[PDB]
């Protein structure tokens, strides 16, 4: 789902990643407390954060290449 992420402004990408940290922490915390019952809901956010950091790297490769 990395199209709109390319469409994002590179400034709320940090915001999106921070929210993803928050939600992953909450859901894992309530997994170890035995209150989660949504396992595919961990790998999906791991996908999301992985894609968000890959796009973030590609973003800063530009100024490295251009400047």
């Amino acid at each position: 789902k990395a199209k709109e992420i390319r469409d994002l402004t590179t400034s709320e990408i940090e915001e999106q990643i921070k929210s993803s940290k928050e939600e992953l922490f909450n859901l894992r915390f309530q997994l170890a407390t035995g209150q989660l019952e949504e396992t595919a809901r961990i790998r999906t956010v791991r996908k999301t954060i992985a894609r968000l950091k890959t796009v973030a790297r590609e973003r800063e490769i530009e100024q490295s290449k251009a400047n």
């Binding site: 940290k21 922490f25 915390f29 309530q30 170890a32």
Partner: protein
């Protein structure tokens, strides 16, 4: 950071007895110090911690079937916050 170090909470009869008091128990990363745990918890839950204690557990032998293994090394921290209440719901 400040969320990657609190791996999980610890729930058990001794942890439950500690929770009778304001002491909460967590399973933290293996490369952190007391100060960083204090900061992380008081950043997340908005609590004010008074002290924290850390201990390192050695890898334990575990045989699964015919293959022997070792469990992962653990680092556990105990907080004793004053005001506040880490809710583990």
């Amino acid at each position: 950071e400040a969320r990657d170090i609190l791996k999980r909470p610890v729930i058990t009869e001794k942890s439950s007895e500690a929770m009778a008091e304001d002491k909460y128990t967590f399973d933290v990363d293996t490369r952190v110090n007391k100060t960083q745990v204090k900061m992380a918890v008081e950043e997340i839950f908005n609590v004010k911690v008074a002290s924290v204690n850390i201990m390192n557990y050695k890898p334990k032998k575990k045989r699964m079937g015919r293959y022997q293994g070792y469990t992962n090394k653990r680092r556990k921290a105990i907080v004793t916050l004053k005001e506040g209440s880490i809710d583990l719901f």
